[PDB]
Design a protein around this ligand. Structure first.
Ligand code: HEC
Ligand code: HEC
Ligand code: HEC
Ligand code: HEC
Ligand code: HEC
Ligand code: HEC
Ligand code: HEC
Ligand code: HEC
Ligand code: HEC
Ligand code: HEC
Ligand code: HEC
Ligand code: HEC
Ligand code: HEC
Ligand code: HEC
Length: 500
């Protein structure tokens, strides 16, 4: 009952109220049958100048009357001819309700489809897609901008973007809507390559929009960089923008951004460039603009719950079990030091000149030099204290009573925690002190080789008592890290039975 190929035909509703229900149409069911009878798309779609219309048996919608005749004459005509041939067929001319069906045809499994970097690269890498306007580059086969001089579309070198950047839910001006744009360009090419029997893309509705079909697409794990002329190192500045006089100026040190490293770890460009490839400050000025619906630069970069912001995406990262043990327990400090991981001094510039705009009109190559400098000048990772310098096992028995004191495997766990982190660079860079990792459990005191006892703040005598403090911390981390043994229900694996 789940289908991804449903079309609810309701085109004449634009001309006025419909007398009868819209007509449900299974496109994949129809192309399969048409193929089997030796026909193709041309059975139902006309073309004009080598471009196939996506409309049924027409190039324009001229009137309600004309449209009704096109549907009835052509839809029913085929059904009738198949009937007298004694073949499987659809509703006959007199079965009004069988097409004009008030009850839904099937359920919809339809899913949107898009290019992650793997799929985009599988297209870039295809021999079947030939270079355009270049000895090697493939880009012009798919990407365009409108050239006002020639009054036509041309490949705009290094101005390639997702189709969504210029094609919307509805056709604005002579830019078609996204669905028309994609259905036209994508499927047309797929059908051409299919003729050469070189590997190609889907033509069936289900082939693109069915979750089952999507799961089957070959994925490439190591995907080459998609180079469109973007910086390796970006310099993000508190851009005020022309509007709002006086306008807000920045108050922090500037931020250098390793754009190249982030590409390698992200799954596309759009994740961050959510409207179009450009700066962020084009819309998210310090004060915000109408074009950002007044979302300010600060929000764009710090929004804790958005995948688009520095802090937000990093926040999803720390929800990994290897991180979540500590990160589901600790509270951010918002200390100057932590802010300083991103906001750093620029070489040769003072604070007064940066939030004066001294950097705003520098050439891309020059700001890259400045940014790369800021990136390389960041101190080397201090790592963690030598684990041999902390107790290997601590006895937790301050409140022993019903059980024996816990013999806590202190050093072994810390070692596992560092192992679990591995070469994660987000962990390496933001864990700025030798004892930062220690604070994942020893919270609310400075990073140190010698943190105070929990009892110094808990249940001695807001805050939990000492037993609650232990249980919540121990059991909590194990749940978040998916630690199987010990089980939280195993009441003796952390503190052995009284006597017995
Ligand atoms: C499937 C093969 C059809 C059969 C059998 C009948 N109709 Fe139909 N009709 C069909 C389509 C694809 C459309 C367009 C639907 C839309 O809303 O765009 C139509 C259109 C009409 C209309 C005009 C639109 C409306 O007012 O709802 C009418 C009045 C109409 N159809 C009538 C009608 C009757 C009475 C039929 C039995 C004699 C009949 N239809 C059969 C598809 C099919
Ligand atoms: C007649 C039985 C059809 C055959 C064979 C093919 N298509 Fe079709 N298509 C048909 C209809 C009735 C419609 C709805 C438009 C209308 O004027 O009522 C369509 C629509 C499409 C679409 C758009 C889908 C959507 O956006 O909802 C596409 C992209 C499309 N069709 C492609 C297509 C191709 C490539 C075909 C051969 C493989 C083909 N169609 C055959 C009817 C029929
Ligand atoms: C031959 C070129 C056809 C044209 C043009 C249209 N249809 Fe059709 N239809 C055709 C066949 C051979 C079948 C049966 C397919 C099968 O495998 O059973 C059908 C069936 C339908 C149905 C019934 C769907 C179902 O519930 O099983 C409907 C409602 C239907 N057809 C609608 C329809 C409309 C509205 C068309 C114009 C847009 C149309 N069809 C054209 C063959 C052909
Ligand atoms: C803005 C930079 C655009 C991006 C990114 C994409 N498209 Fe586009 N497209 C754009 C304009 C200004 C127009 C209208 C041209 C005119 O004559 O005024 C278009 C048009 C199309 C069309 C229609 C013409 C045709 O090819 O038959 C298609 C099919 C189309 N666009 C597809 C398309 C796809 C698939 C894109 C992502 C790969 C894409 N466009 C991006 C502007 C822009
Ligand atoms: C030529 C100019 C194409 C355009 C435009 C689009 N696609 Fe494509 N596609 C093309 C080829 C040559 C191939 C084969 C690549 C290979 O592996 O050799 C493909 C393949 C796909 C696939 C993968 C199918 C599978 O793995 O089974 C999909 C899902 C796909 N294509 C989708 C797609 C979409 C949605 C497009 C516009 C947004 C699009 N393609 C354009 C060639 C061309
Ligand atoms: C992969 C090459 C496609 C094939 C084959 C078909 N569709 Fe498609 N469709 C495709 C894209 C890339 C898009 C744009 C949005 C997206 O999914 O990325 C669409 C869009 C639609 C829509 C419009 C959804 C909306 O937001 O209004 C529908 C309902 C739709 N597509 C239907 C459809 C049908 C019925 C097809 C067979 C005729 C079909 N599509 C094929 C990509 C591809
Ligand atoms: C990297 C993950 C960030 C951390 C950690 C913090 N900030 Fe940030 N901030 C970041 C970016 C990418 C930007 C835009 C570039 C710029 O420097 O303007 C910002 C911007 C601000 C702003 C607005 C601009 C300004 O007033 O100068 C403020 C007020 C700001 N940042 C404050 C701030 C503080 C107090 C932080 C620690 C709690 C902090 N930031 C962390 C990136 C990152
Ligand atoms: C047609 C088969 C393509 C070729 C060849 C190239 N691109 Fe592409 N690109 C294509 C599509 C359909 C899309 C949008 C996919 C979506 O789901 O939105 C794109 C997108 C881009 C982007 C934006 C990345 C993103 O986050 O979506 C860029 C920067 C881009 N394309 C660049 C690019 C370049 C430089 C290419 C030649 C090396 C190139 N593209 C080829 C389809 C196709
Ligand atoms: C978030 C992790 C990003 C990913 C993934 C990609 N980009 Fe990016 N980009 C990002 C930021 C924060 C910035 C700085 C913008 C600012 O306001 O300073 C950028 C900048 C660019 C630029 C430079 C534009 C300019 O300075 O005029 C380009 C051209 C660019 N980005 C392109 C791009 C492409 C094509 C990507 C996929 C291959 C891509 N970016 C990913 C953040 C992120
Ligand atoms: C104008 C074309 C914009 C550019 C360039 C960037 N953004 Fe944006 N952004 C814009 C709008 C219209 C909105 C509000 C509507 C919306 O899409 O949410 C936003 C919003 C954000 C947000 C907030 C998300 C949330 O959940 O609250 C963030 C964090 C954000 N944008 C980030 C961001 C970044 C990092 C960009 C450069 C890569 C960027 N934006 C550019 C408009 C525009
Ligand atoms: C997911 C969409 C991310 C967004 C948006 C941003 N970051 Fe990021 N960050 C992310 C990962 C998965 C990584 C590891 C890959 C890497 O680039 O090393 C990181 C790491 C950092 C680091 C440490 C390493 C480095 O590249 O310098 C810093 C200092 C950093 N991130 C900064 C940063 C800023 C300032 C961003 C907003 C402009 C930002 N990140 C976005 C994932 C994602
Ligand atoms: C306990 C041993 C830790 C583990 C395991 C991980 N992190 Fe961590 N991290 C920890 C502390 C005590 C702090 C200091 C918080 C403060 O505000 O002073 C941090 C901080 C970070 C940050 C900075 C932003 C923040 O969330 O406060 C990041 C981005 C970060 N850590 C990332 C991170 C990742 C990706 C980890 C798993 C690979 C990870 N951390 C583990 C303690 C501990
Ligand atoms: C390790 C992950 C634990 C599990 C599982 C359980 N407990 Fe626990 N508990 C733990 C610690 C580190 C401590 C402190 C030890 C001390 O004596 O200081 C405790 C403490 C208690 C106490 C209070 C002390 C006492 O009366 O002996 C009780 C009564 C207690 N815990 C009960 C208990 C039960 C019934 C459990 C099974 C559900 C259980 N704990 C599991 C660590 C861990
Ligand atoms: C959670 C998994 C821990 C991490 C990460 C680190 N330590 Fe820890 N330590 C932890 C507990 C539950 C206790 C018991 C404290 C109590 O009050 O019962 C301890 C204790 C210490 C002590 C002894 C304190 C005292 O008894 O007065 C020291 C000196 C100590 N731990 C140091 C330490 C350091 C420096 C770490 C980072 C390398 C570190 N711990 C990590 C839990 C956890």
């Amino acid at each position: 009952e789940k289908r991804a190929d449903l079309i609810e035909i309701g085109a004449m509703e634009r001309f006025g109220k419909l007398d009868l229900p819209k007509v449900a149409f299974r496109h994949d069911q129809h192309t399969t049958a048409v193929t089997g009878m030796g026909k193709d798309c041309a059975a139902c779609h006309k073309s004009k100048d080598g471009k196939m219309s996506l409309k049924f048996m027409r190039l324009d919608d001229n009137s309600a009357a004309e449209l009704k005749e096109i549907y009835h004459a052509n839809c029913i005509g085929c059904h009738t001819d198949l009937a007298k041939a004694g073949k499987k067929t659809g509703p006959q001319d007199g079965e009004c309700r069988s097409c004009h069906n008030p009850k839904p045809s099937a359920a919809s499994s339809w899913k949107e489809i898009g290019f992650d970097k793997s799929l985009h690269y599988r297209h870039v890498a295809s021999k079947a897609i030939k270079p355009v306007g270049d000895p090697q580059k493939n880009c012009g086969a798919c990407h365009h901008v409108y050239d006002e001089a020639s009054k036509k579309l041309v490949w705009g070198k290094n101005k390639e973007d997702s189709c969504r950047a210029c094609h919307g839910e509805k056709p604005v001006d002579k830019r078609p809507a996204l669905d028309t744009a994609a259905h036209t360009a994508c499927i047309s090419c797929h059908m051409d390559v299919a003729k050469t029997k070189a590997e190609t893309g889907p033509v069936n509705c289900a082939g693109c929009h069915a979750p089952e079909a999507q799961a089957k697409f070959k994925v490439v794990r190591e995907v080459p960089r998609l180079d469109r002329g973007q910086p390796d190192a970006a310099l993000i500045l508190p851009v005020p923008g022309k509007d709002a006089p006086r306008e807000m100026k920045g108050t922090m040190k500037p931020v250098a951004f390793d754009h190249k490293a982030h590409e390698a770890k992200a799954n596309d460009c759009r994740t961050c460039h959510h409207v179009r490839i450009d700066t962020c400050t084009a819309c998210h000025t310090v004060n915000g603009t109408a074009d950002s619906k007044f979302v300010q630069l600060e929000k764009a970069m710090h929004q804790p719950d958005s995948m688009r912001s520095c802090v937000g995406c990093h926040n999803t990262r720390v929800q990994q079990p290897t991180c979540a043990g500590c990160h589901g327990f600790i509270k951010p400090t918002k200390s100057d030091a932590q802010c300083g991981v991103c906001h750093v001094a620029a070489p040769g510039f003072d604070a007064k000149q940066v939030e004066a705009g001294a950097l705003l009109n520098l050439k891309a190559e020059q700001r890259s030099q400045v940014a790369a400098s800021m990136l390389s000048a960041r101190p080397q990772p201090k790592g963690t204290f030598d684990l041999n310098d902390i107790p290997e096992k601590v006895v937790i028995g301050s409140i022993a009573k019903e059980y024996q004191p816990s013999e806590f495997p202190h050093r072994k766990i810390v070692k596992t925690l560092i192992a679990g982190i591995g070469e994660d660079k987000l962990a390496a860079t933001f864990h700025i002190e030798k004892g930062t990792l220690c604070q994942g459990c020893h919270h609310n005191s400075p990073a140190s080789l010698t943190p105070p006892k929990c009892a110094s703040c808990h249940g001695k005598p807001d805050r939990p008592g000492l037993k609650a403090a232990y249980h919540q911390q121990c059991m909590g981390c194990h749940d978040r890290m998916k630690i199987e043994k010990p089980a939280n229900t195993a009441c003796v694996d952390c503190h052995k039975e009284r006597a017995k």
